[PDB]
């Protein structure tokens, strides 16, 4: 129902930065050809400082993107990659273990900045209460942007500099973000009062994304890596899998009601009620926010089941079909990792190291 209290969302912490002393290496490199990019390096230093201590807001995303871009410009003028002559140590903290990990590679710095871009977007997406349509739309967009950052990171930084940025972990992050993005669209679909069948397809897709997320969290090696984060994330995700399965079948039941298929209607409502109860069991101990959403949905599905079974038992007398005989709901993918372009002039601005003569 459109008025259902909203589920909480998961967001990711930003990684903590160590040193990246690029200045002495850059100066030494350019002196190999007068006062060696001195003002230009000062600007970049300020940009890094702003980025590594980024304000946790929307403008902060711009800060991260601009620094990321200037890092690419520097990379192209001064060889600071792995094995290259002007490479210096880059140090960041691995977020799961708290270990300092160092690499003499400017791409490692780029990677961590891109990671924090994704993490910050995950934060911004999770802040609105999502009762407003725009709140849902903007939250959805942020989650797709977060997915976009992690996906770009996974594909274009394959070295996997630390365990928190491995392919498995980044894919988990992507699928979690896409799931939360699609969930925002489910909320919107109900606020917009779309066709019940469409709401079902959208909710079914939420389940699919969350299944893939839960899948990764159930990997024992991944689970031991994350520790209690895995336990914390999995509680919500697994609960949501049965919750949105219930929501899907609630609306397939509504479609049945619209099509005057009253046997089918009871079958779907019963399935939704069974699935919701399983979510409630799984939600034991979780915050009142989760409990309030489940309570609300229990009222809706419980009332509609009763009425549907009542009407069928007294009036329509239609056979209640097994679900396996019915056409299963196909998830509708409406979200994606939104493209990141590190060298987008719109976000980076002029190459800091532009040198006419």
């Amino acid at each position: 129902m459109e008025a259902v209290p909203r589920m909480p969302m998961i967001w990711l912490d930003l990684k903590e930065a160590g040193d990246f002393h690029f200045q002495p290496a850059v100066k030494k490199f350019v002196l190999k050809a007068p006062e060696a990019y001195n003002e230009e390096l000062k600007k970049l230093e300020l940009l890094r400082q702003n980025a590594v201590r980024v304000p946790r807001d929307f403008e902060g995303c711009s800060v991260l993107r601009k620094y990321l871009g200037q890092l690419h410009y520097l990379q192209s003028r001064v060889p600071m990659g792995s094995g290259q002559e002007a490479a210096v140590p880059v140090t960041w903290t691995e977020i799961f273990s708290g270990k300092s990990v160092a690499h003499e590679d400017i791409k490692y710095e780029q990677a961590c900045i891109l990671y924090n871009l994704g993490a910050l977007h995950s934060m911004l997406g999770a802040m609105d209460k999502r009762v407003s349509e725009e709140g849902m739309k903007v939250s959805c967009t942020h989650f797709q942007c977060a997915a976009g950052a992690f996906a770009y990171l996974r594909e274009h930084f394959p070295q996997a500099y630390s365990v928190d940025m491995s392919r498995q972990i980044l894919t988990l992050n992507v699928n979690l973000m896409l799931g939360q993005a699609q969930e925002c669209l489910l909320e919107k679909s109900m606020l917009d009062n779309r066709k019940s069948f469409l709401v079902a397809r959208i909710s079914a897709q939420v389940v699919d994304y969350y299944k893939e997320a839960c899948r990764a969290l159930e990997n024992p090696d991944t689970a031991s890596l994350l520790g209690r984060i895995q336990k914390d994330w999995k509680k919500l995700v697994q609960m949501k899998i049965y919750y949105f399965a219930a929501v899907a079948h609630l609306h397939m039941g509504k479609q049945a009601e619209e099509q005057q298929k009253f046997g089918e209607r009871v079958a779907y409502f019963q399935s939704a009620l069974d699935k919701l109860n399983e979510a409630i069991k799984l939600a034991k101990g979780q915050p009142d926010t989760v409990q309030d959403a489940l309570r609300f949905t229990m009222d809706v599905i419980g009332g509609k089941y009763n009425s549907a079974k009542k009407d069928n038992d007294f009036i329509y007398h239609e056979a209640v079909p097994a679900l396996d005989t019915l056409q299963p709901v196909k998830g509708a993918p409406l979200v994606k990792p939104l493209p990141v372009n590190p060298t987008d002039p719109a976000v980076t601005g002029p190459d800091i190291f532009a040198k006419l003569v």
């Binding site: 959805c140 942007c145 469409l198 993918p333 979200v335």
Partner: peptide
């Protein structure tokens, strides 16, 4: 909002048949 617009494209295509 250009970003939000792109992010909502698939949704709107779906609901507008």
């Amino acid at each position: 909002n250009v970003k939000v617009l792109e992010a909502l494209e698939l949704y709107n295509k779906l609901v507008n048949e």
